[PDB]
Amino acid sequence: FSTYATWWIRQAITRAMADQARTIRIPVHMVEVINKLGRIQRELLQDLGREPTPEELAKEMDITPEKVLEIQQYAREPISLDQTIGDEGDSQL
Amino acid sequence: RRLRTVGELIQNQIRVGLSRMERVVRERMTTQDVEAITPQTLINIRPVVAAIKEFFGTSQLSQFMDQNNPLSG
DNA sequence: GCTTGACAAAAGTGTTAAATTGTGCTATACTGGGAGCCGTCACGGATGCG
């Protein structure tokens, strides 16, 4: 039973994370693209040594560099409006 | 009372980053084949660099240099 | 001043093709987490352990 149950458990966990891990909800079809981009970038960083450029990633993913830039823009995470800018418990963002 | 110099402060963050890296290595170690497995596949360098960057840019000890005059610096 | 008339130029609908998105599924075996924890310092007052 464990062999079949593991697939479904992993699927449910990943889907729930995709649907509920961000304040601004991104559909699953975009989360998949973002994860693919991240994995490709991580793989490239090891062998290239430098920071991969947008064009190389775009070619490796068979998409235009503008699409890579758009995906990166979508990857932004909102920041908390209650920070400690001031180095003291005096002022927030 | 002892003194933590810059070297020790950086060493602590390196230790934390390597601990996170080791946790990731443990997670990945028992998930793929044992024959065609190489250090590159299961070694993720992101946590250590992330810790190093966080310390320099966020730690209260790492401070914006005072450049009013040579004596200040 | 006040109309009529002949025409481009935009405001509106119809229908398709396309892009986006919401669900479902994948069969070796896998079966209890991990961050802890750092000099006030005094003051009352409630709690709970024996």
Is the CB of residue A20 inside 7 Å of nucleic acid strand C? no
Residues 6+ positions from A87 with CB-CB distance below 8 Å? B60
Side-chain-facing half-sphere of B24: CA atoms under 13 Å: 16
Question: Helix or strand or coil: residue A70?
Answer: helix
User: Is the sign of the CA dihedral B8, B13, B14, B18 positive or negative?
Assistant: positive
Q: How far is CA A45 from the centre of its chain?
A: 16
Rg, Å, chain A Cα set: 18
Query: Which residues of chain B have a CB within 8 Å of the CB of A42?
Result: 44, 46
Residue in chain A nearest B59 by alpha carbon: A87
Min Cα–Cα distance to chain B from A43, Å:
9
B44–A87: do the CB atoms touch at under 8 Å? Answer: no
Give resolution in angstroms: 3.1
Amino acid at B69: N
B53 touching chain A per CB within 8 A: no
Query: Which nucleotides of strand C lie under 7 Å from a protein CB?
Result: 20-31, 39
| Burial per residue of A53-78, b for 16 or more beta-carbon CB atoms within 10 angstroms, e otherwise | eeeebbebbeeeeebbeebeeeeeee
Residue pair B52/B17 in contact (Cβ under 8 Å)? The answer is: yes
